[PDB]
Amino acid sequence: GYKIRNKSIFWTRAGWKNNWHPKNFNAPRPSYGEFTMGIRCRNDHHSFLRYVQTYRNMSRHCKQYFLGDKQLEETFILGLRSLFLVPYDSQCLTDQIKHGGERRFVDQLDRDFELISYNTHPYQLFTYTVRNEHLAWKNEQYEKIQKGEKTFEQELLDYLDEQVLAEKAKLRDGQNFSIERMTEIALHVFRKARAGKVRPAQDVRGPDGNVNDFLEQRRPFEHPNPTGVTH
């Protein structure tokens, strides 16, 4: 499609794609004991254990509001690890960061836990909303199954199993029913099904170039005055 044409896009004064130690005039320089009288520094060697305790708190303090949902605790754990594995797998050389990446990430995670302790972190609220929307749909299926009724998801699974038999019952010259064929059969069913639903307009433009919004009503004028409520 389109690729960045500038070959020097990732160049910095410090090197190629360097976002760990940008070049600045006041660069780090060494210190010599025999000549150093006093010093004021905030660096220390406590980040490793603070990285550990921070993980335990963020996990244990967020589980307070999961109500024993084991599947959510396990899903949240996978998401929590993705937040702590950022420095271990990033392109950025987190080991060469300016003034210590270890202290930087730890202090950054602490600001997240502060919000987690109050149950105000956006990832928490995002989790509650996403889960409630999920359980409502699983309960809708349960109520339909207890009534002996068939779910919309099973009607497709059953409608797709038969469509495969019809295709392989005529596919006798060959006998390699690829995953590609299996896929485009389902998509042909999904498009037909989705179009059947009364969904809000998602694409800007319909079959014509014109937009599918309620505002795309141009001339000619054929609508009369609006009518009132009926008694």
Ligand X SMILES: CCCCCCCCCCCCCCCCCC(=O)OC[C@H](COP(=O)([O-])OCC[N+](C)(C)C)OC(=O)CCCCCCCCCCCCCCCCC
- As a whole number of angstroms, the distance between CA 72 and CA 127 comes to 9
Residue that is written with structure tokens 């995002």 in the block: 126
7 binds other proteins (CB under 8 A): yes
Q: Is 188 annotated as a binding residue?
A: no
Q: Which of residues 13, 45, 56, 111 is near ligand X by CB under 6 A?
A: 13
Q: Is 43 annotated as a binding residue?
A: yes
Closest separation in Å from C-beta 25 to ligand X:
5
- The full length of the chain comes to 231
In this structure, the dihedral spanned by the alpha carbons of residues 119, 122, 127 and 128, taken in order and rounded to 10 degrees, is 50
Q: Of 9-17, 45-53, 74-82, 162-170, which segment contacts other proteins by CB under 8 A?
A: 9-17
**Restricting to residues 152-171, which ones interact with other proteins according to CB under 8 A?**
none
Of 75, 70, 77, 74, which is closest to residue 56 (Cα–Cα)? 77
Within 10 angstroms of residue 183's Cβ, the number of other Cβ atoms is 10
Q: Which of residues 27, 45, 78, 122 is near other proteins by CB under 8 A?
A: 122
Closest separation in Å from C-beta 24 to ligand X:
7
Closest separation in Å from C-beta 41 to ligand X:
23
Phi, psi of 228 (to 5 degrees): -90, -175
Which 8-state DSSP code applies to residue 94? G
Residue that is written with structure tokens 């309960």 in the block: 139
Site for ligand X, rule CB under 6 A: 13, 25
Q: Which residues are annotated as a binding site for ATP?
A: 43, 45
Q: Which residues are annotated as a binding site?
A: 43, 45
